[PDB]
Amino acid sequence: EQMIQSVDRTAVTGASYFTSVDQSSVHTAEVGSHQIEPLKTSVDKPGSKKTQ
């Protein structure tokens, strides 16, 4: 007896301010990552509320 896995159905997915409960779920695709640059085209810090 070998069981074939399935897809999830009910889960709390969404932002803290933007929340929607789905009855049919799907795994979100993600390829690549946030690649760091040893050569940055700008020499600044990234913008934030602390500097704005």
């Binding site: 399935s6 390829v31 690549g32 990552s33 690649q35 640059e37």
Partner: protein
């Protein structure tokens, strides 16, 4: 007194262009011969070091429906089992739809690999019945249309219920050929006993009828994805494949 001499060998000053070690460069325009490094920043690590990328991913090769008004055992669509197969096109834009596997293998003479056909049906949950995917090996040309349904039960095959909790069957085709590879006879323009294109054909039979109510559809369409495993090709060339017009 210096002693430096060599003998001039033959085949001198003839451009060699078959391999990588003779088609490299002895010279360069680079000041102080500079090297350009690797930066995985603007891509994110999505890097191709081998041609297996466009092969294993299933790509749509064909399309056929399944009506409910057909007899049990009627032949629906054969699949000539090769990576060269595709029948779709587009009118906007005007483009003959290749598959991503049909572009890799068309730049070669020979092909070899265990092809994995993925038949994604699109039913409702209540469209019931079964189909038969019977692969018959050999070459691209035998009278497989004359093989009866119970005669096709002699060959190895598989059945698939249209209803259930999944809708895609991954059919791993065995490497059944008289030759250990299979030449691009599409590059040539003549049939010859010994050179061929496919390792066999694959009839979609009507194994059972399509039972469904009237508030759903009377037909279920089946996409034909094209994927593979353990794929090998050699003897490179250039060829643009043409649509197999079934």
């Amino acid at each position: 007194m210096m002693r430096n001499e060599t003998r001039v060998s033959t085949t001198e000053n003839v451009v060699n262009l078959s391999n990588y070690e003779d088609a490299r460069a002895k010279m360069s325009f680079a000041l102080d011969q500079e090297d350009w490094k690797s930066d995985p920043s603007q891509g994110g690590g999505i890097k191709i070091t081998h041609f297996t990328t466009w092969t294993s991913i299933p790509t749509l090769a064909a399309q056929f429906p399944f009506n409910a008004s057909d007899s049990v055992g009627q032949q629906i669509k054969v699949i000539p089992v090769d990576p060269y197969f595709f029948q779709m096109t587009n009118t906007n834009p005007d483009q003959k739809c290749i598959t991503a596997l049909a572009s890799i293998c068309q730049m070669f003479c020979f092909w070899r690999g265990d092809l994995v056909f993925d038949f994604q049906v699109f039913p409702t949950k209540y469209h019931s019945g079964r189909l038969l995917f019977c692969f018959v090996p050999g070459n691209e040309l035998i009278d497989v249309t004359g093989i009866t349904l119970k005669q096709a039960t002699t060959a190895p095959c598989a059945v698939m219920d249209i209803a259930g909790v999944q809708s895609t069957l991954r059919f791993r085709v065995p490497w059944i050929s008289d030759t250990p590879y299979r030449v691009n006879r599409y590059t040539k323009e003549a049939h010859q006993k010994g050179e061929y294109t496919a390792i066999g054909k694959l009839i979609v039979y009507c194994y059972n009828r399509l039972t469904s109510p009237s508030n759903v559809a009377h037909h279920v369409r089946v996409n034909v994805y094209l994927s593979a495993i353990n794929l090998e090709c050699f003897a490179p060339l250039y060829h643009a494949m043409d649509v197999t017009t079934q």
